[PDB]
Amino acid sequence: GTKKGVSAAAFSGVTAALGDVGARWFYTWAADPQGITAPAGTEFVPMIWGRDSVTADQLQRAKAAGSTLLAFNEPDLAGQANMSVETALDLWPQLQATGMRLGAPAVAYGGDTPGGWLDRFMSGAAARGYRVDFIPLHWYGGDFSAAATGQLQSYLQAVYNRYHRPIWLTEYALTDFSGSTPRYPSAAEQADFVSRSTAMLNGLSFVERYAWFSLSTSTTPTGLYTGTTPNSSGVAYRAAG
Numbered sequence: 001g002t003k004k005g006v007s008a009a010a011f012s013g014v015t016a017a018l019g020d021v022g023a024r025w026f027y028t029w030a031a032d033p034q035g036i037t038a039p040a041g042t043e044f045v046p047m048i049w050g051r052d053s054v055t056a057d058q059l060q061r062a063k064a065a066g067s068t069l070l071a072f073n074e075p076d077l078a079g080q081a082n083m084s085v086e087t088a089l090d091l092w093p094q095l096q097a098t099g100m101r102l103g104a105p106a107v108a109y110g111g112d113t114p115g116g117w118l119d120r121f122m123s124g125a126a127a128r129g130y131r132v133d134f135i136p137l138h139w140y141g142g143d144f145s146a147a148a149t150g151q152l153q154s155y156l157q158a159v160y161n162r163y164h165r166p167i168w169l170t171e172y173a174l175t176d177f178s179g180s181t182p183r184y185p186s187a188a189e190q191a192d193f194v195s196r197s198t199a200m201l202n203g204l205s206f207v208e209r210y211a212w213f214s215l216s217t218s219t220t221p222t223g224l225y226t227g228t229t230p231n232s233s234g235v236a237y238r239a240a241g
């Protein structure tokens with residue numbers, strides 16, 4: 001359908017790469033496409049990344065660039081938006097007042113955990129009569145076996161069960177962050193995971209959209225393309241339909 005998207009940055013060849021891979025949507029972690037010209041049929045989704053992104057100017061920019069709005073990126077991490085639940089909720093009315101379909105902040109992990117960041121955000125939002133239309137999630141698997149897709153599915157199901165909001169998977173890949181440096185799968189393991197995970201996500205009715213992290217190897221070792229050339233993972237992602 002229209003589920004398959006990617007995160008992207010401007011690199012030489014990005015327009016070609018978005019069209020080649022069949023991305024129906026994309027985002028840039030910013031309020032506008034950050035210099036990317038989208039192919040026809042590829043929808044841009046703006047993001048309000050952190051506390052300092054919440055300005056009349058950024059919110060007007062976002063509304064001019066797209067119709068769906070993603071909120072803060074990994075507020076639960078000191079290295080990312082680094083925001084208390086209270087701060088996110090206090091800023092929420094400015095994002096709500098755009099009128100756009102509105103995604104929760106994307107937590108790095110523990111979205112299903114009672115008392116965790118997302119739980120306290122969703123409980124506070126309900127108590128304040130706020131609108132949260134969908135929940136975007138991040139998932140990085142450290143088990144590089146064929147079991148990985150079912151572990152991803154379990155997390156998405158858990159979050160769906162807890163808040164009953166449609167799910168977006170705005171970043172996912174196999175990456176183990178448990179050690180002092182990141183661990184990555186082999187190219188074959190990564191391509192097999194792309195195939196099996198996309199088949200799973202295409203069939204899961206409460207997942208509206210997904211986005212592999214990320215389109216370009218300039219962004220991450222789990223990239224799908226180097227310039228306009230897909231690797232075996234890009235090939236598998238293109239084939240996901």
Ligand SMILES: OC[C@H]1O[C@@H](O[C@@H]2[C@@H](O)[C@H](O[C@@H]3[C@@H](O)[C@H](O)O[C@H](CO)[C@H]3O)O[C@H](CO)[C@H]2O)[C@H](O)[C@@H](O)[C@@H]1O
Pocket residue numbers: 028029030034049050051052053073080219
């Ligand atoms: O909007 C105000 C705000 O902008 C922030 O800049 C963001 C970057 O934080 C963001 O970085 C992305 C990471 O969050 C993510 O994990 O990885 C990707 C890929 O490497 C990064 O792009 O990227 C967007 C797009 O360039 C920027 O707008 C500032 O960090 C923040 O201080 C400032 O308040």
